Amino acid sequence: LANLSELPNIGKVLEQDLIKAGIKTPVELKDVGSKEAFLRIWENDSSVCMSELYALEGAVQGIRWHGLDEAKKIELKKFHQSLEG
């Protein structure tokens, strides 16, 4: 398998945060999905941001996040809004 940090949108720091949250490979990331991965990281470090949720979803979909469809961006913004608070 690829390293998490080779996936689109996932740099070294997001890879470290995923690993610290228990998500260690692309297969684990796709299994849990972006929203749940984000929440797990948030439980450790609440500085993880709306942009990093977009990055995780892009990684799951295998695309740079700028290209996410509009409905998905709005869904993820609505999720991040529900959390904060």
Added chain:
Amino acid sequence: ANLSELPNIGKVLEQDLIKAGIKTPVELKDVGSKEAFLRIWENDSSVCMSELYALEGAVQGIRWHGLDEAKKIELKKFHQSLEGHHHH
């Protein structure tokens, strides 16, 4: 993407960037954080280290909190020099 969809860029920093002629993420990457910071600082010298870190983190696609230590020190040296504290 909009500027305010990039990591660390709030609505007010997006407005400051636009006012300084930096209107898109591509335009921000093209000029980089130090030039973008100078442009906003020229308009408002109250912008400060926080904004510089935010801008570099935006360029790198990461929360500023994750910037490498070398980059953070590089940015601090630049900011200190701008604000009247060059190294001796």
